[PDB]
Amino acid sequence: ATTLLHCGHLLDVKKGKWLEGVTVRIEGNTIRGIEKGYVAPKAGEKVIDLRSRYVLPGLMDMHVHLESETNPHNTLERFILNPADIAYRSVGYARKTLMAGFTTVRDLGGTGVNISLRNAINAGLIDGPRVFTAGKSIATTGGHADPTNGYRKDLMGDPGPYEGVANGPDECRKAVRQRYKNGADLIKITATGGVKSGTAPQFTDEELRAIVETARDYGMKVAVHAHGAEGMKRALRAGVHSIEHGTYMDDEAIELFKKTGAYYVPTILAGQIQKTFAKAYKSGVKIAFGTDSGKSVHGLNAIEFELMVEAGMPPLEAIRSATLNAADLLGVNNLGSIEAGMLADVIAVEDNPLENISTLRKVVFVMKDGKVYKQE
Amino acid sequence: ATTLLHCGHLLDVKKGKWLEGVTVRIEGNTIRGIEKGYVAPKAGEKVIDLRSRYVLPGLMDMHVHLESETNPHNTLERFILNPADIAYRSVGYARKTLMAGFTTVRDLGGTGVNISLRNAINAGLIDGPRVFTAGKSIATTGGHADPTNGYRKDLMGDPGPYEGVANGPDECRKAVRQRYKNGADLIKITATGGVLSLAKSGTAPQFTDEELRAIVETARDYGMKVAVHAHGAEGMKRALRAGVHSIEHGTYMDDEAIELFKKTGAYYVPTILAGRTPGYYAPIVIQKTFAKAYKSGVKIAFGTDSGKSVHGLNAIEFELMVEAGMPPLEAIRSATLNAADLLGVNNLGSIEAGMLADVIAVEDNPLENISTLRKVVFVMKDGKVYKQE
Amino acid sequence: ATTLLHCGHLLDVKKGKWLEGVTVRIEGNTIRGIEKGYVAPKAGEKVIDLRSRYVLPGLMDMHVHLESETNPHNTLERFILNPADIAYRSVGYARKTLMAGFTTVRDLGGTGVNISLRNAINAGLIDGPRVFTAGKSIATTGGHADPTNGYRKDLMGDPGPYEGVANGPDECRKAVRQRYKNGADLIKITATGGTAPQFTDEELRAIVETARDYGMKVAVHAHGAEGMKRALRAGVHSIEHGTYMDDEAIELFKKTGAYYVPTILAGRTVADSPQIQKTFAKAYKSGVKIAFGTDSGKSVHGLNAIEFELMVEAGMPPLEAIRSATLNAADLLGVNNLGSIEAGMLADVIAVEDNPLENISTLRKVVFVMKDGKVYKQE
């Protein structure tokens, strides 16, 4: 099927330039090209008029928790909610994410329901974003992602690699292999105590090396939840692809960031972080857009944009952190740019996003894989 | 707020009469009344024009399996599917149910995900009909609802009351209490062998009188009605003597069972659609009966066992009931008033003051062609409009 | 497909008469008729020459253990043998059974490999008799059919209904239901040991009622008098061995109609490595119904016909012994298409060299075997 978009301004996100009075030609699910003028439709061609709108690539959030959302009894809910209840909440969470304009997301940690949500979205059963999910986060005994942390002793048990808790290199290798078995796209680990403590490193170098090498064997990237400097630097030298939060980032940690090329996902919205992200941006750290949505109501992801520009980030590069940098961090080459040969993920807002980023908090047109999900 | 439906024809199912050019006034979720004429909207009230349409109470299906639907890989998928996958499929199945016009359904067997779907629909998380669910069906070892039937010996295990498998009165009492604990609305048991399970036989009675007595007495203590799937005559008669509220399928129903039905007052749910619909099933896998049942005076409630044929095609069953000789008005009464009686609800099944706004509309007269209910043009549940063409 | 059997003598077991120079017409797997003379085949018709032979319906043994064969390492073998090894031995046991002329058997005890063996024979994967198997026998804790009897305390465990061990009516009901779930044809229990009765009247009632609910008959192993009469009052369909039988049990047999399966062969073989011949003689003389059973498994498979000789040696007439292997067996099984050569029955046909009514020992060399219209042995 063929669809033509009459775009008043469409962002060449790579060339950093607005294109004026242009047409987008989409065949099936893929953008077939960009043509000059408002091309009148050939027979069988569906046309959407966005001449008064600003047109963007599909926005991507690299830190989301689609299974959950913050709630006045979040700790109690860990003991009474079953997988089906979580799935039914996740349905609404995913749809609101999609209609906020975030057509692609990276689910960084779950109970395994996230894998099912990804499979249900891909089968066409549930309206949602493209999900790349880590499945269960991997942690060490007592780590931040240890599921039975703080439990009564009767219920605490001995979590092992099958459950996402590994100790030592061989158990780490098996835990990575198990996440691969469960259908996870990527691996996520918690290298420091996060949010009985919260900066001491919870991973040895040998364990981090084992995990990075295993993930490289199965073509999965490694994302790291890290607040402490020591664990963050251990992960950075281990060869991980992404560091999340980084609340206490050392100057040595920034030198490691730029030398390794790992991405820093700021996660200011879940929040020191504003200063840390500002200093990181000034220093040249590669930045990818991430909200850690779930702690923050799903559908308000765009808010993060404003505060990143409030920390001194130029609007254009903030959008690149949500688009091109996101696709690079994902390791996918068919997303993050409106160009010939790429996948038809299109966003549209009312006013110019580079003059006021807050217009992205009201995305008026959302199209994923060629289908229009929102058109006002 | 307040919404007025301008109905050209609106069915009073209790009087068996169409009302011509009337207005249905609903405030919130309750119909406040029916007024003659097309009442003009006062200030800020919403109006829906069904003047060219025939308007009905919300249809109800008293045998649905909202967790699953029939497909060539059902036996494999019992080993490959997780609870969350079942839930995500449940989303679409429930939506097809609601847009077919079935505002209320009784889910008669599942893994327990059906309970979560009911709680999610009631919480406003999922678009769906009002679901009354039995949770996990209760069976005896090797029974029709025994979950690990046909599994490898290592994977089959020894299911017990927690799993919905009971043997003896004490285990039956515990299993009913477990369904209560899990949040089930009603109890459903399989009194004889079924058709879609992987048990060898399908006509032998799988419940003793003492076990059935335990099931009924425990259910009455915790206020849950009992529905019994029975294809064999003897198991059906044991269930009827036990004091159950409804019998499902009843494919081989004897005359002793017919007057048993009449004496106990139990409802008969035929599920002809399921009992009608290569290399497909496992190796070891009624129109007249329904006619005889209606002729005898047995109370009838509408049921399709949709799931075994696709959800949203439930209305097809109506047609079969009329071709087996049941009058159209009484088919609609079996899906509306009789269903509401079987559930134990007094605010469903009729468009009248004080009841909940479950309203359907079709294009042509259902009493002249019941098959028009296969194209429902308007669907409204609890005051919210879900379908308007 | 059509096959014609030119039989010199064909025994009509019902009228007790030899029929001379006859043709049996079989289409597919079913006997279509019996005609006088040796009819010549038209096109697409195949003829088997049995003119010098005596032709009988397929013989049936109502007590066999196809899973095992007795052998000096039986106690150790259960501890070292896996299901697959048992199946691989069962292959040869089934072939030896079918080639002796026993086209139908009732396997009265196993670990469940017998059920798979029946399904494999029925699928045509392995040559074998029509098997009706009890699966795992049901016993009480420590009962004769308790699987972990004599085990080390480490390995003995607590076997329950799933494993075939029941105590009390609810457990018995559950054990019957589990055998149904596993696909068993009938239920078999051990009601006595030494001789002490191991089943209470209430438990026997639970088992009989549950088995009848699922349409399965009940076969009962009982050597003591007390267990035998408890079972006979409960309503069992057959009693096996019954070595110590009182004159009350004999009126019980005659009133209930349960069959008596003597199993003289296994009694003689155990007496090698007696009373049972005396008991069978008295039982037959009293008018108890007798069905043929050898408990081969305890004796080598393929020697089942030997049992015939012993029943004639105890005084039962040859015609009645052959009827115990055919008509009486088919009645005990509850099938109406086996045990007789006539129109509408299944083409299970055996042939021997000499007149079995004159010497039953000729049944020890079966020269022709056809099961389900298919010929397995033709010499």
The three-state secondary structure class of A236 is helix
A221 closest CA partner among A94, A106, A59: A106
> Using a CB-CB distance cutoff of 8 angstroms, which residues of chain C are in contact with residue B149?
181
What's the one-letter identity of residue A231? G
The CA-CA-CA angle for residues C111, C117, C123, to 5°, reads 150
With an 8 Å Cβ cutoff, are B88 and A83 in contact?
A: no
Taking alpha carbons only, the member of B305, B324, B318 closest to residue B360 is B318
Residue B331 and residue A189: Cα distance in Å, rounded? 60
Q: Are C44 and C27 in contact (CB under 8 A)?
A: no
Closest by CA position to C302, among listed C85, C42, C112, C128:
C128
Method: X-ray
Q: DSSP states of C123-159 as a string?
A: TTSS---EEEE--SPBB-TT-TT-TTTT--HHHH---
- If contacts are CB pairs under 8 Å, which of residues 134-173 in chain C contact chain B? 160-162, 169-171, 173
For residue B105, give how far its alpha carbon lies from the nearest alpha carbon of chain A (Å).
19
Chain A's closest residue to B83, CA to CA, is: A84
Q: Give me the residue from B142, B153, B170 closest to C177, CB to CB.
A: B142
Distance separating alpha carbons of residues C224 and C256, to the nearest angstrom: 18
Q: Are B176 and B135 in contact (CB under 8 A)?
A: no
Calculate the CA C198 to chain-centre distance.
24
Contact status of B323 with chain A (Cβ, < 8 Å): no
Residue with tokens 């058109």: A375
As given in the structure block, the two tokens for residue C285 are 């003389």
Amino acid at B59: L
Residue type, A306: E
Neighbours of A59 (CB within 10 A): 26
By C-alpha distance, which of B264, B268, B347, B313 is closest to B62? B268
- Any idea which residue has 């294109």 for tokens? A19
Chains C and A make contact, 3+ CB pairs within 8 Å = no
Q: Token pair for residue A151?
A: 């439990």
Element (H, E) at C35: strand C30-36
Between positions 66 and 85 of A, the ones with CB within 8 A of B are 82-85
Best CA proximity match to A210, nearest among A123, A138, A147: A138
Sign of CA dihedral C346, C351, C357, C359: negative
Burial A13-29 (b: 16+ CB within 10 A, else e): beeeebbeebbbbbeee
Alpha carbon of B382: minimum distance to chain C alpha carbons (Å): 45
The whole-angstrom distance between residue B327's C-alpha and the CA centroid of its chain comes to 20
Per-residue burial over A299-325, b = 16 or more CB atoms within 10 Å of its CB, e = otherwise? bebbbbbbbbbebebebebbbbbbbbb
Contact C3, C48 (CB under 8 A): yes
> Chain A closest CA to B362's CA: distance in Å?
28
Where does residue B64 fall: left (phi above 0), alpha (psi -120 to 50 degrees), or beta otherwise? beta
Strand partners, C283: none
Name the nearest CA neighbour of B61 among B300, B314, B353, B242.
B314
With H, G, I as helix, E, B as strand and everything else as coil, classify residue C86: helix
Separation between Cα atoms, residue A167 and residue A207, nearest integer Å: 8
Cα separations (Å) of B244 from B167, B225, B289? Answer: 19, 7, 20
What three-state secondary structure class fits C57? strand
Q: Could you tell me which residues come within 8 angstroms of residue A287 by beta carbon, excluding any fewer than 6 positions away?
A: A263, A264, A265, A266, A280, A281, A308, A313, A317, A321, A325
Neighbours of C1 (CB within 10 A): 11
Contact, B179 vs B217, CB < 8 A? Answer: no
Sheet holding A102-107, edge to edge: A59-64, A102-107, A130-133
Find the CB nearest B149 among C170, C181, C214.
C181
> Are A337 and A30 a contacting pair, CB within 8 Å?
no
Comparing alpha-carbon positions, the chain A residue that sits nearest to B95 is A125
Residue A224 CA to residue A241 CA, distance in Å, equals 8
CA distance C301 to C324: 19
Closest CA to A287 of A329, A259, A316: A329
Q: Would strands A45-57 and A346-349 be described as parallel, antiparallel, or unpaired?
A: antiparallel
User: What residues contact A249, with CB distance under 8 A and at least 6 apart?
Assistant: A229, A232, A264, A276, A279, A280
Q: What is the DSSP letter of B18?
A: E
CB-CB contact of B64 with B274 (8 Å): no
Buried b (16+ CB within 10 A) or exposed e, A33-49: ebeeebbeeeeeeeebe
Residues 6+ apart with CB under 8 A from C274: C267, C268
The answer to whether residues A40 and A51 touch, using CB atoms and an 8 Å cutoff, is no
Sequential DSSP letters for A97-148: HHHTTEEEEEE--BSSHHHHHHHHHHTTSS---EEEE--BPBB-TT-TT-TT
Phi and psi for A318 in degrees, rounded to 5? -60, -45
CA distance B112 to chain A (A): 9
Q: Judge whether B330 and B300 are in contact, CB under 8 Å.
A: yes
Question: Which H or E element spans position C4?
Answer: strand C2-12
- Are B167 and C169 within 8 A, CB to CB? no
Interface-testing mutation among C86, C180, C182, with chain B (most B C-beta atoms within 10 A): C180
Rounded Cα gap, residues C107 and C128, in angstroms: 12
**Dihedral of the CA atoms C201, C206, C210, C211 (nearest 10)?**
-30
C-alpha C102/C-alpha C80 separation (Å) is: 30
Residue B153, Cβ density class (10 Å: 0-12 exposed, 13-18 middle, ≥19 buried)? exposed
In contact, C347 and C10? CB cutoff 8 Å = no
> Which residue's structure tokens are 């065949």?
A27
Residues 6+ apart with CB under 8 A from C14: C327, C340, C342
Q: Cα–Cα–Cα angle for A133, A138, A139, nearest 5°?
A: 150
CB contact under 8 A, B199 and C215: no
Query: A46 - beta bridge partners?
Result: A3
Q: How many residues does chain A have?
A: 376
H/E element, C179: helix C169-182
| Mutant choice from B141, B153, B197 vs C, greatest count of C C-beta within 10 A | B141
State the distance between the two ends of chain B, measured CA to CA, in whole angstroms.
22
Q: Residue B15 class from Cβ within 10 Å (0-12 exposed, 13-18 middle, 19+ buried)?
A: exposed
The Cα A278–Cα A273 span in angstroms is 8
Spatial separation of the C-alpha atoms in residues A275 and A268, rounded to whole Å: 10
Beta strands in B13-133 (DSSP E): 17-27, 30-36, 46-57, 59-64, 102-107, 130-133
Resolution in A: 2.6
A348 phi and psi angles, rounded to 5 deg: -145, 135
d(CA B140, CA B145): 8
- C-alpha span between B191 and B241 (Å, rounded): 12
Q: Do the beta carbons of residue A257 and residue A285 sit within 8 Å?
A: yes
Tell me the C-alpha distance between A142 and A193, whole Å: 9
Nearest by Cα to C65 from C33, C10, C106, C107 = C107
Catalytic machinery residues of C: 188, 295
Q: Of A370, A304, A367, nearest to A56 (Cα)?
A: A367
Which helix (H) or strand (E) element contains residue B78? helix B74-80
Alpha-carbon span C36 to A62, nearest angstrom: 90
Interface-testing mutation among A68, A82, A88, A182, with chain B (most B C-beta atoms within 10 A): A88
Q: Which residues of A touch B66 (CB under 8 A)?
A: none
- In whole angstroms, what is the distance from residue B179 CA to residue B185 CA? 8
The enclosing H or E element of C10 equals strand C2-12
Is the CB of residue B35 less than 8 Å from the CB of residue B25?
Answer: yes
Cβ pair B185, B134 in contact under 8 A: yes
8 Å CB contact of B91 and A126: yes
- Give the residue among B291, B250, B255, B269 at the shortest CA–CA distance from B338: B269
Measured distance CA(B187)–CA(A311) in Å, rounded: 60
Q: State the DSSP string of A267-281.
A: --TT--HHHHHHHHH
User: Which residue type occupies A147?
Assistant: P
Both tokens of C359, joined, read 């010497």
Q: Give yes or no for a contact between C68 and C107, defined as CB atoms under 8 angstroms apart.
A: no
**DSSP bridge partners of A49:** A6
Q: Are B268 and B246 in contact (CB under 8 A)?
A: yes
Q: How far is CA A180 from the centre of its chain?
A: 19
User: In b/e form, how buried is each residue of B50-80, taking b as 16+ CB within 10 angstroms?
Assistant: beebbbbbbbbbbbbbbbbbbeeebeeebee
Q: What is the sign, positive or negative, of the torsion defined by CA atoms of A166, A171, A175, A178?
A: negative
Breaks in chain C (C to N over 2.5 Å), named by the residue before each, are 193, 273
In which region does residue B311 sit, left (phi positive, over 0), alpha (psi from -120 to 50) or beta (all else)? Answer: beta
Question: β-strand A102-107 against A130-133: which pairing, if any?
Answer: parallel
Q: How far is CA B181 from CA A5, A286, B2, B106, B385, in A?
A: 55, 53, 39, 19, 34
CA distances from A107 to C47, C175, C274 (A): 75, 49, 80
Residue C24's alpha-carbon distances to C6, C7, C126, C379, in angstroms, are 7, 7, 27, 18
Token reading at C174: 């559950």
Listing DSSP states for A284-331 in one string gives T--B-----BTTB-TT-TTHHHHHHHHTT--HHHHHHHHTHHHHHHHT
Q: How far apart are CA B333 and CA B349, in angstroms?
A: 8
Number of B–C residue contacts, CB under 8 Å: 49
Question: Cα separation of B90 and C273, whole Å?
Answer: 66
Q: Is C125 exposed, middle or buried (CB count within 10 Å of its CB: 0-12, 13-18, 19+)?
A: exposed
Q: In what order do the strands lie in the sheet with B246-249?
A: B187-190, B226-230, B246-249, B267-269
Which of C308, C273, C275, C313 lies closest to C291 in space, CA to CA? Answer: C308
Strand partners, B269: B248
**Bridge partners, C19 (sequence order):** C10
- What positions of A carry a catalytic annotation? 188, 292
Contact B88 A87 (CB under 8 A): yes
User: Cα(B354)–Cα(A215) distance, rounded to whole angstroms?
Assistant: 62
* Strands lying side by side in the sheet with C59-64: C59-64, C102-107, C130-133
